[PDB]
Design a protein around this nucleic acid. Structure first.
Lengths: 786, 112, 112, 133, 56
RNA sequence: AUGAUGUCAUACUUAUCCUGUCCCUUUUUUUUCCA
């Protein structure tokens, strides 16, 4: 079917790519001409000996670095236990003392450096987080007055293993999957669905034939956790046989039997191995996740299961989406695992609610004051609401004093500082109660034990993208039925818990949708359209969807990719189209990077690209240090637009030597900075692929603004005397207050985001020239409109 | 010493080791825990400065010698009001000298 | 820089705690202090520009505070320069205390 | 006088600098003695297998590090170093323990940055700091 | 820095004005400046040195 | 001898305002001769 012509085109692409790289290699070896008396040699031979000497010194202490590392690296896992003999013991004291000797022999030089620059130098006329220990000896300075058991480990592992809800269900379901190729495995949390199932399949011999067993997760770090625990059971090194591969992080070697990955990782394994020939089992976890990659892989592996019968497809999930799961996958049997640890007492409010924030407040007030021991988890929508909540709780804390006991209020969302995310993971201090105000991120992949109460406001921030004007609005929306169901299910994991819903049984059973809109519907799909055009699906209409998108959204998608030129006047891939297609980011950015080659602003567009990759969480804006943060941010504000502001901040951070306390001092989230750095170098790792030459704009921000123009020409707005209004649609937008030009208000602006918060907005904007729009897109932007 | 050992024990210093000694010591213990430890760690030479404020403002500061944010609060006169009332006669002996009963207000706990 | 500036501006506000009948000139000073409390980087840019380039200043006023057994001179400087001087003051005392300029016998000290 | 003092400061400085320099050269030559005798004391039943394991692990270590340096210019720096810092990563890897801190009923019972002494004004009623009843 | 030193010493040399009398400070120190604490204590430091001797 | 109608500007009154409009949930993506 379409699968096979797709694969046809794919293998054709792979050979064409190989030949293209080969042609490039020979071309450049052509372009670089390898042109490669007595006292002449007697002169330069000393000098080549000079560089020999010097680069040999660097290389020499480099091999000393090698074995310096290697001594302590090898002696770590051999010496401290085993009954070893004279020779290697002698060598231990040797390497120990001798590396210490080298360390001190360079410490001598360093010491003399610093003590010899310590001194007084007459001036010359020429035209880590402890400021509460810098303020704790100030007081103590002011207040002074002087004048085998590893077998036991494995037995314990297996003993707990025996108490899984899948351990008695072992052999029946193993025979079950031995029968039918397609198996629905419905199971709740804690069942061992993610851990024990691949162990079993290892035990079954599905690994022989050189085969692998894939387990994919919707989240990298969740994959890491699952992998770590399964390797703990496996008693081996995580990474050689039980291994995981996600972005920037390979922890797999050619011993890999159990390979854990994300759904996009498996998609990109479909960039390398279409038939999945070395994997005998693909186990897709919690597919209810409703991910772009989930519903891509579903269709692709459905076609595989049709065309590869001895292949093993196991897709396990938590919730009742098994009806449509089987229906699309032609009525697979549904093996029921019963897993639910402890009973959950769910309460309803007596009537509906009016101001659910104060209801949250007073609910946790009473729960704390009157309940017996046990942690509290409470859901809100997000950051603004969440700090207002903690404000209210800590206000009550202050006012009621020691008539209460210790209420560690702990807010949590995704973009708050990572140390303060880790803050909630400490075991609770005796006597104190631990109350976590959370976003639905703590619905999934955050398992904080001890939670015995949980309260649900029945709401959530759902994205909603109407393409008919291109509106992506993160709006308030009463939460799904399954959503509240597992928001209940988030509790009980260690004891009988409670879940109080802020709404009635009436509103619940009556006014509740089952599952949140399968994202394929709601999301904007540019990257996945470009991706299935990368694999060669010409007819994207009769493609094997589980949930098709509305024809309109794919219409505007195709018109977009045509406009930026990736499609020809009938809608298939240009050479630009495919090369931009391999880049795992939306085509806006990819085409701007295409323009950076033309304008010679390579590195700058690379860095801006890397910046918008994670941007939403760059700058911390605490309430207790508002003005210091605002000012450390206003420091970088450069003229031209906030994109080059991000450029400048990354420039200054890398300037520091990639320091964390740099970003701490300058009020920038280290997480975003670090990930932007690694994503920039990943784009450089693909940089030779897409035929990009490394040149800098030489301080010519005109080139960089024009490359941004060529990339985001669609993303532009113009002045109207009734506000800022779109160029094409002429519907009204507004300036983000956090924008570096928020009050400069340019006549011609370029943007990157499109939301409609409490007012219609666009984020990370820049001032543009309308002439560059005709310079870039005279076929889409004509003069009459500007 | 309780701090060091609470690092050794790595337990948390709880309110019970610090409510016997809450207003004692010269800074004061309740200074360790005020709101602005973070921008007052950078105010140095404040004592000389309040001394020299006498050449800038036309008024005389009777507490030229101290600072409440830095030195704590070195006196508490809240028993003085109570014992002043008990020595004048009590609220009854005090209000028989007043127009209190000619107001017919039922009792003096509501006065404002 | 912002901690040193916050300390300077709080110290300068401490004069008109009363929020009295003050005058035009104190009104103008309070205006400068508030707009520098809102926008702290135009302030600091100005401050360092001053410290770098300025060497001829306006005129000071003098008057005497009568303490009945001697008089005290009281000097009256203009607002823009009062802000630049307050920040310079904080910066110098902070750095001097970190590099240990003043040996332990120079004693209106912050420790007792 | 300022020129004379500048010169005397500079020359006294380099005087003592050089003297301490020679002191460090002495220190490091006795470290040379120490190192030679270290290897000398070095040179003269799990050891055999843990030793084949030494060469085992270190040798495939050099193989993997070689070929890392080879495939990507520094993917030894793309793989080994960046592996060992990020938060949920470390939580997943079971890494243990990756200053004094105390109760928070204590904090923020008090707020402000200015002395309550009014800056020299006296005519306001600040005698007691807790209402009578 | 010579810049701050020049600011501080060029700032003590101003015109002092009472009702209708005006003169110029050229010799002493105006104590109603805000860094006058620093000048007074540093100069007093120099005089502590003259009184004690560098050795003591 | 003062009717309202007013697109009349000014004069005036509330010692009436000048601070009092602003902020995004979740999250994944293959890489290539080192030297």
């Amino acid at each position: 079917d379409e699968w096979e012509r797709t694969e046809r085109e794919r293998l054709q692409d792979l050979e064409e790519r190989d030949a293209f790289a080969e042609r490039v290699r020979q071309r450049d070896k052509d372009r670089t001409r390898n042109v490669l008396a007595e006292e002449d040699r007697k002169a330069m031979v000393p000098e080549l000996r000079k560089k020999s000497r010097r680069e040999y010194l660097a290389k020499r202490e480099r091999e000393k670095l090698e074995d310096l590392e290697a001594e302590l690296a090898d002696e770590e896992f051999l010496f401290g236990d085993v009954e070893l003999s004279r020779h290697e013991r002698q060598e231990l004291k040797y390497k120990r003392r001798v590396r210490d000797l080298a360390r001190e022999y360079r410490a001598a030089g360093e010491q003399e450096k610093l003590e010899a620059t310590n001194r007084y130098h007459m001036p010359k006329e020429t035209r880590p987080g402890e400021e509460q220990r810098r303020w704790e000896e100030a007081r103590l300075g002011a207040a002074s007055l002087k004048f085998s058991t590893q077998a036991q480990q494995k037995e314990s592992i297996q003993a707990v293993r025996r108490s899984l809800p899948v351990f008695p269900f072992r052999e029946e379901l193993l025979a079950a999957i031995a029968n039918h190729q397609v198996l629905i495995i419905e199971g709740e949390t804690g069942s061992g669905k993610t851990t024990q199932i691949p162990q079993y399949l290892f035990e079954e011999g599905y690994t022989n034939k050189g085969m692998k067993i894939a387990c994919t997760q919707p989240r990298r770090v969740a994959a890491m956790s699952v992998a770590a625990r399964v390797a703990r059971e496996m008693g081996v090194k995580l990474g050689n046989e039980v291994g995981y591969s996600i972005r920037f992080e390979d922890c797999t070697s050619e011993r890999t039997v159990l390979r854990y990955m994300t759904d996009g990782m498996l998609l990109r394994e479909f960039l390398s191995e279409p038939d999945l020939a070395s994997y005998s089992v693909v186990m897709v976890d919690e597919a209810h996740e409703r991910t772009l990659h989930t519903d891509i892989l579903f269709g692709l592996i459905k076609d595989v299961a049709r065309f590869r019968p001895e292949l093993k497809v196991l897709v396990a999930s938590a919730t009742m989406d098994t009806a449509r799961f089987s229906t699309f996958f032609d009525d697979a049997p549904v093996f029921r695992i019963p897993g639910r640890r402890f009973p959950v007492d769910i309460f309803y409010t007596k009537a509906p609610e009016a101001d659910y924030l104060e209801a949250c407040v007073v609910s946790v007030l009473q729960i704390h004051v009157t309940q017996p021991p046990g942690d509290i988890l409470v859901f809100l929508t997000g950051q603004e609401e969440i700090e207002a909540a903690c404000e209210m709780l800590q206000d009550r804390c202050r006012r009621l004093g020691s008539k209460i006991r210790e209420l560690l209020v702990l807010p949590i969302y995704a973009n708050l500082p990572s140390d303060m995310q880790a803050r909630i993971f400490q075991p609770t201090p005796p006597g104190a109660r631990k109350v976590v105000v959370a976003t639905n991120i703590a619905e999934t992949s955050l398992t904080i034990e001890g939670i015995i109460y949980v309260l649900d406001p029945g709401f959530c921030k759902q994205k909603s993208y109407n393409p008919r004007t291109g509106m992506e609005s993160l709006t308030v929306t009463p939460c799904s039925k399954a959503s509240a169901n597992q928001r209940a299910g988030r509790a009980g994991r260690v004891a009988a818990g409670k879940c109080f819903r802020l709404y009635t049984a009436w509103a619940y059973q009556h006014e509740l949708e089952e599952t949140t809109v399968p994202e394929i519907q709601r999301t904007s799909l540019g990257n996945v359209v470009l991706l299935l055009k990368s694999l060669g699906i010409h007819d994207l209409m009769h493609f094997d969807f589980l949930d098709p998108p509305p024809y309109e959204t794919l219409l505007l998608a195709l018109e977009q990719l045509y406009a930026l030129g990736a499609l020809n006047h009938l809608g298939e891939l240009t050479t630009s189209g495919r090369k931009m297609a391999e880049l795992p980011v939306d085509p806006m950015l990819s085409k701007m990077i295409l323009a950076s080659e033309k304008y010679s602003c390579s590195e700058e567009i690379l860095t801006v690209a890397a910046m918008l990759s994670v941007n939403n969480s760059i700058f911390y804006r605490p309430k207790d240090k508002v003005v210091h943060a605002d000012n450390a941010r206003v420091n970088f504000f450069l003229p031209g637009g906030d994109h080059l502001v991000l450029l400048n901040v990354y420039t200054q951070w890398a300037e520091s030597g990639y320091s964390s306390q740099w970003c701490y001092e300058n009020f920038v989230q280290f997480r975003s900075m670090r990930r932007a750095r690694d994503v920039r170098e990943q784009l450089e790792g693909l940089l030779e692929r897409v035929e990009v030459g490394l040149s800098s704009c030489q301080g010519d921000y005109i080139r960089v603004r024009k490359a941004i123009t060529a990339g985001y020409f669609y993303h532009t707005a113009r002045l109207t005397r009734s506000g800022y209004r779109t160029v094409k649609q002429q519907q009204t937008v507004f300036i983000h207050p956090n924008s570096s030009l928020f009050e400069q208000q340019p006549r011609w602006l370029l943007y990157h985001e499109l939301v409609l918060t409490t007012k219609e907005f666009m984020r990370q904007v820049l001032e543009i020239e309308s002439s560059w729009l005709l310079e870039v897109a005279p076929h889409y932007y004509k003069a009459k409109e500007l | 010493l309780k701090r060091q050992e609470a690092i050794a024990q790595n337990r948390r210093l709880t309110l019970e080791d610090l409510e016997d000694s809450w207003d004692r010591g010269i800074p004061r213990i309740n200074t360790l825990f005020q709101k602005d430890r973070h921008t007052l760690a950078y105010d140095k030479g404040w004592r000389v400065r309040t001394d020299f404020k006498q050449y800038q403002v036309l008024k005389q500061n009777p507490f030229w010698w101290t600072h409440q944010r830095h030195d704590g609060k070195l006196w508490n006169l809240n028993n003085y009001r109570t014992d002043m009332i008990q020595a004048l006669g009590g609220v009854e002996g005090i209000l028989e000298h007043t127009l209190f009963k000619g107001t017919y207000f039922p009792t003096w706990e509501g006065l404002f | 820089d912002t901690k040193l500036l916050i300390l300077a501006l709080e110290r300068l506000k401490e004069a008109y705690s009363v929020k009295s009948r003050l005058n035009q000139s104190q009104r103008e000073e309070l205006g400068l202090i508030e707009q520098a409390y809102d926008n702290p980087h135009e302030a600091l840019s100005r401050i360092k520009r001053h410290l770098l380039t300025q060497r001829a200043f306006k005129e000071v006023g003098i008057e005497f505070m009568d303490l009945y057994s001697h008089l005290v001179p009281v000097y009256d400087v203009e607002p823009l320069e009062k802000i630049t001087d307050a920040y310079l003051d904080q910066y110098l005392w902070y750095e001097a205390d970190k590099r240990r300029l003043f040996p332990p016998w120079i004693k209106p000290a912050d420790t007792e | 006088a300022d020129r004379k003092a500048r010169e005397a400061v500079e020359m006294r400085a380099q005087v003592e600098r050089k003297m301490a320099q020679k002191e460090k050269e002495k220190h490091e030559e006795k470290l040379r003695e120490m190192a030679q005798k270290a290897r000398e004391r070095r040179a003269g039943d799990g050891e055999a297998r843990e030793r084949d394991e030494i060469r085992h692990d270190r040798r495939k270590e050099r193989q993997h590090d070689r070929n890392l340096s080879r495939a990507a210019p520094d993917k030894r720096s793309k793989l080994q170093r960046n592996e060992n810092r990020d938060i949920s990563e470390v939580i997943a890897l079971g890494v243990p323990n990756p200053e004094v801190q105390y109760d928070q009923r204590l904090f923020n019972q008090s707020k402000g940055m200015d002395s309550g002494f009014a800056g020299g004004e006296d005519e306001i009623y600040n005698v007691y700091d807790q209402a009578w009843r | 820095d010579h810049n701050i030193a020049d600011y501080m010493t060029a700032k003590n040399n101003v015109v002092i004005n009472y009702k209708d009398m005006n003169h110029t400070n050229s010799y002493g120190i105006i104590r109603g400046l805000q860094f006058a604490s620093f000048i007074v204590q540093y100069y007093g430091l120099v005089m502590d040195l003259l009184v004690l001797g560098l050795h003591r």
